[PDB]
């Protein structure tokens, strides 16, 4: 398919690796009882192994010569061959939660600078104000692009600068 | 034009890490050589001076020579 | 220059609080070279929060 | 009790409680959704 | 007049000061302005001398602190017993000690970490533990998980009692200074009651519980079938069935016919051959003797009656012509300065831990311990490290005394003064002897490396070329082995197999055999002497020049912990005694790493192994390979690192992960050790600018770490990295080849 | 105030003798001699290590470098409220008085002192190092 | 000898003088500040360059500056 | 060269030899650039040009180098 990679459900080293992990787990399994808790834990392990290999073969991942899933990081090639779930949807999910954390921290900083003890509200966290901003932070991309377009996202050149500049 | 794979991906990323980081120390040493906010008159001591003493919280390896020195390790 | 308690902006370039805002304590009326006493709510690397400045190093902003 | 809540509002206690919540949330998600790599 | 003295209700129990960080320090109670404050808050949290000048308040603080420590340790012991009862294979191990691996930790089945639960035997899965608790519990006579559970509850109750005792003796009834200064009474009570009654009550438990249960366990009867300990106390007929002495009761004790107690108070020596541990009858006699000795020792100092010695009088009585006033003033020093006491107690406590390591490897006191090679390596290594750290601490607090508490107008022409007054001679001689030791010890290795590389093995220092035999140690060994025949007539065997003699094996494994000392042993012992002498040089120089030197004449006014006195006079970085502790820490790591490497390789090469002759774990390569650095590099590190580097995909994979992680942390320390805070402060300036541009600059100002904190972080990550590396190497190696 | 003279026949403090005293610098180059007058007999701390008893009256010690005499001066001045003065002595026998060189201690203003090494400008008003290239030596821009 | 300079931002707080371990600095009459005092460095031949004066100076930036220069036996702090 | 790339030790030695030479020479380039800033740079001769404007946005430069170094290192 992409880059000479076969799909994992078509790959043979993928099936060999699945069979090898089952072989190691059953060689460890064959030295216990039946209803014993080590045997129960190893059968749960084998169930999770089979479920994991079936889910990775179901998700349409691409395997190499080693039988291991390879990820495709190109928006157009991923959206063309059905691989947006591995890099593209995770990167927009990450950027949503990372801007969430950063915007809630920025709103807490701006809220606590407007008092007579900003360092005291930085050492001892104002929990109601922090939870208020943490719930209100869900509209952070809209609020961020609005603060961008008003010219209030950015401080002017009243910043601290060195002698050189 | 050797065949490349995910190991080659990870190592070229580590290479970019090393290049950007060494460039960070060297560019910081070049541009903070005239002076910084910790030491505004760094040009008056020259290129390779030891320090400016334990005052102002202590200033160890503050010189541009010392920034070079820290960047030879990253090289 | 500026009166007591008013806010100024520091333009001495090698100051720690250059391009930032402090508060005037007093202005000495002798022939002293740096009469404007300004306090800053943050400390420098020496842990000092107060410095003398000149008339052309402070701007009432 | 007010002073005990101020002590619980101090920084390392809130870092401990919040990282316990975040780590437990990720642990719970990795238990009920075992081994996620995609989507 | 020795009496109880206490102030009523000094400090109110309130949550107010919990809500005010840094309340204890007048400087730090102002609040935070830069980030440095936080670090200061944690660094000076327990430096009670910098809080108050009042010795009474300081003494009370340290007393309740000690109670807190004891409560924490009791929580820890409670945890170990509870995990040994609920999450272990202890009973199965009791039923088959030679083929079941001790395990008392299990992991949950999430994110694949379940693989760490390996096949330890007994129908159990977990991580093999190497603390030696199973052998301790079998030696104590514990047979069921229920007894361990009850011990866990007991230890938790005792932890609650210790934390109540802390709160009580700080907030409700806090002892006075003249209570704390009753050192004669304190020595009497600790030598009698603690050591004396401790070993007496333990000998009681041994004689009454340990001996019969372990005698039956060595006889072979099933643990569940063995009578419970309370039945042994209740029905003395069973005790008379195993040891007929108990039939006569306590009549031979009071009538002084003690010879009839020879059934359980013995002097056999050696090891129990079916069990590989010291005879519990020998251990019982030993604890009875120790008990009587310490109870005699605890009645030496005068308290509320005329009889008894006086510490100041014994000190002031020993004066000679060479030393002048002699030990005058030392009583005053050791009853007013906590740091001096802490220095002495740390030195002897560390040394004692190292002696514990050696005597416990050499004379295995617990059953099925000597053949649990992982437990032996772990215990020796652990207690050696603890020892070394406490010695460095001793040097640290000695220097802290020298700077803060030393006052020469009560200390004028004294032992301490003369030491201070000829410190240049002391340090110069120590300097020379360190260089001498370094040259000849390390130079033999470099010489051997060169000769071996040049194809001239006949010119090396080895057992077949130019021999350097440890004649003195061999003579002491031979004397020790021949001692039972002449100089200790009542001894059936030597105190340890390593002196010479036969061979005790358990389950096909070698418990202990005679250790032979040759040229390689000569060379490593002189390496040890060298490294120890250098560590002593650094620490002793630190304490002798803590106050002044020709470079810094007024160093005392700068404190114990300070970065320097500026780049002038050529440069004065690391002139403080704290910095001498910092370097001594690195040198202590060096020394003890070579010590534990010596132990590991020597045991695996010349002692341990299976009995068919004995096939050793590394075939006996020590005597020929341990003379070159290339030999240590190839036959020890490279060869034995196989197990750790190929531990992936098994239960030992965590040791590979911690191998890599420890290498990483060690390397991560080098950034702090090799760099300086000026660069980092300027970098932080640029980053602060970036945060200012986006209105996210914090009100607490980001500062680079202090010079001394950079050094502290450096040495801490350095030690953690290196020590954890050797930990993972050792454990993976000895568990896979054990 | 006039410049005092060194009396070499001044009794020394009671001291058993350290290994941290003088060296060949005292015989070849220079050594310094510190002199004070005490009010009572009292134990102090020697800057080279150890304890010593000062006498009641004139005292006399001799040190290698200058910072040792400053350290003993600071100790005797802040702890005992004494007024010492220490000199510079050469193997020729040349005796150079100093501290207090004016007779009044330098931590307070005295009329008659000439100000030396005073740049009458800010530190930010110094020139760039390009303006002081190719003089007879290495120069800093603050030298001019 | 080390180059020690005094700048006109001095407020005559005497902190540098009481911080120098060598008696190099002293206070002179002046009119530029309210204290009517200025520091001065007439004995820089005995200066070792420890920079205690610079640590003690309160002004921002420094009014006393130590430029490490050519070394002698006095500036290296040698007792031998 | 003829029968290079069949001498594998020659291949590895020459590659590693010119790569370490290149790294030292790049560090020296940035070192002598910092020496240029301290000794030779006249600001009045360069009032407004590209070399002065680099000193004007040096904080943005070091900030974005710090960002790319931290990003590549973490990931
Ligand atoms: C980070 C840099 C980067 C690089 C090196 C690539 C590389 C590639 N892109 Mg991708 N792409 C990227 C980021 C990048 N992309 C981003 C951020 C987006 C969202 C704006 C896209 C959206 C996208 C689409 C819709 C498509 C590609 C395609 C491609 C492949 C061929 C095009 C090419 O050679 O242009 C060099 C790349 C750049 C100069 C970077 C800018 C990318 C622009 C914005 C889009 C280029 C699309 C191109 C005009 C379509 C060519 C069609 C092709 C059949 C000839 C090539 C592997 C095409 C493909 O699927 O090939 C099989 C394709 O259809 N890309
Ligand atoms: C920094 C690089 C990096 C990246 C990109 C990942 C990514 C991942 N790791 Mg790895 N890992 C890392 C570092 C990293 N890890 C490190 C440093 C360690 C050692 C501590 C590990 C040890 C580790 C283990 C043991 C496991 C993972 C697993 C995973 C997968 C977790 C998916 C998940 O949590 O469910 C999805 C999570 C969420 C949906 C929570 C987000 C909640 C928000 C609201 C969602 C919003 C979306 C819109 C994911 C692919 C798991 C796996 O199975 O890999 C295939 C797994 O078992 N990691
Ligand atoms: C590990 C053993 C240990 C012990 C016995 C102590 C003991 C103490 N600490 Mg210390 N502390 C420790 C470790 C320890 N600490 C560590 C590892 C740190 C981080 C470096 C600190 C950081 C720290 C700070 C910042 C402070 C203390 C303080 C104290 C004292 C007051 C404690 C108290 O009143 O609460 C009583 C304890 C309980 C009622 C039970 C504990 C329950 C909590 C919530 C858990 C007490 C002597 C305080 C002090 O010294 O005041 C002068 C103080 O301000 N500690
Ligand atoms: C013979 C009685 C006796 C005993 C057994 C002890 C035992 C101890 N004291 Mg000592 N002490 C005593 C008398 C005694 N003391 C007297 C008379 C004085 C005044 C001169 C002191 C003054 C003193 C100070 C200042 C300190 C100690 C400390 C200690 C502990 C050292 C830690 C350790 O390694 O123990 C191993 C641990 C154990 C054996 C745990 C068992 C401990 C329990 C409480 C039994 C000990 C008996 C105890 C005295 C009874 C208290 C009853 C109470 C309800 C009134 C140890 C528990 C140090 C300490 O740690 O404080 C907490 C400490 O700082 N003691
Ligand atoms: C130090 C710890 C220790 C303890 C606790 C014991 C305890 C015991 N040993 Mg001993 N033993 C020890 C060390 C110890 N031993 C050592 C070191 C040796 C070697 C010399 C021996 C050698 C030895 C032999 C050979 C024998 C014992 C025996 C005994 C048992 C009876 C002894 C006796 O009659 O005491 C005297 C009685 C007392 C001390 C009475 C206790 C006081 C009572 C409880 C006070 C109650 C007062 C209160 C108000 C009333 C309760 C009211 C309440 C209900 C409300 C007893 C369990 C005998 C035995 O039974 O073997 C199985 C026995 O034959 N031991
Ligand atoms: C390989 C690593 C290494 C080596 C070789 C050294 C060597 C030394 N350290 Mg150092 N140290 C080290 C790491 C090392 N250190 C590190 C990493 C730290 C940071 C924590 C320190 C911090 C430190 C402290 C705090 C101290 C030392 C001291 C010493 C000296 C000990 C005196 C001695 O044994 O002389 C014998 C010489 C040797 C053992 C070196 C090898 C000599 C070879 C075998 C023979 C030389 C002959 C040669 C081949 C001929 C060359 C001819 C050629 C030029 C033509 C010794 C020179 C101590 C000191 O100087 O006090 C005495 C001291 O106090 N070091
Ligand atoms: C550092 C410790 C050390 C020691 C003890 C030795 C010892 C030796 N080397 Mg080796 N060597 C070393 C380090 C050492 N080496 C190192 C680091 C290297 C690498 C550079 C070498 C490389 C090397 C080579 C290539 C060779 C040797 C050889 C030898 C042997 C002959 C040397 C000789 O003839 O010198 C002459 C002897 C002296 C100069 C004696 C001077 C020292 C005296 C005895 C001190 C006495 C002090 C006294 C007690 C003070 C009393 C005072 C009182 C009177 C007042 C000898 C066994 C040779 C050999 O083949 O050996 C078999 C040889 O070919 N070595
Ligand atoms: C393995 C060793 C090691 C590592 C990992 C680093 C990492 C770093 N160096 Mg350093 N450095 C090192 C050795 C190392 N250095 C040595 C030997 C020297 C010679 C003195 C230097 C000298 C040096 C200079 C001059 C500079 C750096 C800089 C950096 C940072 C560059 C940006 C980056 O990639 O960060 C990525 C972040 C990491 C690699 C850190 C990992 C983060 C951990 C995994 C997160 C926490 C994990 C876990 C929760 C921890 C729990 C533990 C608990 C007890 C708290 C980075 C943190 C630059 C810098 O600081 O720029 C901002 C910089 O200018 N270094
Ligand atoms: C031999 C040392 C005898 C030491 C000895 O016998 O001293 C004995 C001597 C006896 O003094 P007095 O009899 O006057 O002491 C009276 C009281 O102060 C002590 O009760 O003590 C001294 O004079 C101090 C001299 C120290 C000299 C230091 C030499 C250090 C050599 C270090 C070498 C050690 C190698 C072996 C280590 C295991
Ligand atoms: C891809 C390709 C191409 C293109 C290419 C290019 C365009 C390239 C470029 C490249 C580049 C573009 C590079 C660059 C580099 C740079 C560097 C390497 C730099 C360095 C720098 C420095 C080192 C600096 C220094 C200094 C300082 C710091 C100060 C001032 C002075 C001075 C300047 C000296 C072609 C089409 C042909 C072909 C196809 C492929
Ligand atoms: S320690 Fe750091 S600061 Fe103090 S002198 Fe040495 S280098 Fe300069
Ligand atoms: S220089 Fe700085 S320190 Fe010395 S006097 Fe003038 S102000 Fe006070
Ligand atoms: S550096 Fe040392 S000597 Fe020179 S002035 Fe500052 S303090 Fe006095």
UniProtKB/Swiss-Prot annotation, chain C:
GO terms for cellular component: chloroplast thylakoid membrane; photosystem I reaction center. Interacts with ALB3.1, which is essential for its insertion into thylakoid membrane. It is a peripheral membrane protein. This is Photosystem I reaction center subunit IV, chloroplastic. The keyword Membrane applies. Keywords: Chloroplast, Membrane, Photosynthesis, Photosystem I, Plastid, Thylakoid, Transit peptide. Belongs to the PsaE family. The keyword Metal-binding does not apply. Stabilizes the interaction between PsaC and the PSI core, assists the docking of the ferredoxin to PSI and interacts with ferredoxin-NADP oxidoreductase. It is found in: Plastid, Chloroplast thylakoid membrane. GO terms for biological process: photosynthesis.
Curated annotation (Swiss-Prot), chain F:
GO terms for cellular component: chloroplast thylakoid membrane; photosystem I reaction center. It comes from the Eukaryota. One of its GO terms (biological process) is photosynthesis. Transmembrane segments: none annotated. It is found in: Plastid, Chloroplast thylakoid membrane. It is a peripheral membrane protein. Keywords: Chloroplast, Membrane, Photosynthesis, Photosystem I, Plastid, Thylakoid, Transit peptide. PsaD can form complexes with ferredoxin and ferredoxin-oxidoreductase in photosystem I (PS I) reaction center. PSAD may encode the ferredoxin-docking protein. Belongs to the PsaD family. This is Photosystem I reaction center subunit II, chloroplastic. The lineage of its organism: Eukaryota, Viridiplantae, Chlorophyta, core chlorophytes, Chlorophyceae. The gene is psaD. The chain holds residues 53 to 196 of 196 of the full protein.
From Swiss-Prot, chain G:
It is a peripheral membrane protein. GO terms for cellular component: chloroplast thylakoid membrane; photosystem I. Its EC number is 1.97.1.12. [4Fe-4S] cluster 2 binds at residues 20, 47, 50, 53. InterPro entries: 4Fe4S_Fe-S-bd, 4Fe4S_Fe_S_CS, PSI_iron-sulfur_center, PSI_PsaC. Keywords: 4Fe-4S, Chloroplast, Electron transport, Iron, Iron-sulfur, Membrane, Metal-binding, Oxidoreductase, Photosynthesis, Photosystem I, Plastid, Repeat, Thylakoid, Transport. It is an enzyme of class 1 (oxidoreductase). GO terms for molecular function: 4 iron, 4 sulfur cluster binding; electron transfer activity; metal ion binding; oxidoreductase activity. Its cofactor is [4Fe-4S] cluster. It catalyses: reduced [plastocyanin] + hnu + oxidized [2Fe-2S]-[ferredoxin] = oxidized [plastocyanin] + reduced [2Fe-2S]-[ferredoxin]. One of its GO terms (biological process) is photosynthesis. It is found in: Plastid, Chloroplast thylakoid membrane. Binds 2 [4Fe-4S] clusters. Cluster 2 is most probably the spectroscopically characterized electron acceptor FA and cluster 1 is most probably FB. Coiled coil: none annotated. PANTHER family: PHOTOSYSTEM I IRON-SULFUR CENTER, PHOTOSYSTEM I IRON-SULFUR CENTER-RELATED. NCBIfam families: PS_I_psaC. This is Photosystem I iron-sulfur center.
Swiss-Prot record, chain H:
Coiled coil: none annotated. It is found in: Plastid, Chloroplast thylakoid membrane. It comes from the Eukaryota. The chain crosses the membrane at residues 12-38, 60-75. Belongs to the PsaA/PsaB family. The PsaA/B heterodimer binds the P700 chlorophyll special pair and subsequent electron acceptors. PSI consists of a core antenna complex that captures photons, and an electron transfer chain that converts photonic excitation into a charge separation. The eukaryotic PSI reaction center is composed of at least 11 subunits. PsaA and PsaB bind P700, the primary electron donor of photosystem I (PSI), as well as the electron acceptors A0, A1 and FX. PSI is a plastocyanin/cytochrome c6-ferredoxin oxidoreductase, converting photonic excitation into a charge separation, which transfers an electron from the donor P700 chlorophyll pair to the spectroscopically characterized acceptors A0, A1, FX, FA and FB in turn. Oxidized P700 is reduced on the lumenal side of the thylakoid membrane by plastocyanin or cytochrome c6. Both potential cofactor branches in PSI seem to be active; however, electron transfer seems to proceed preferentially down the path including the phylloquinone bound by PsaA. This is Photosystem I P700 chlorophyll a apoprotein A2. It comes from Chlamydomonas reinhardtii (Chlamydomonas smithii).
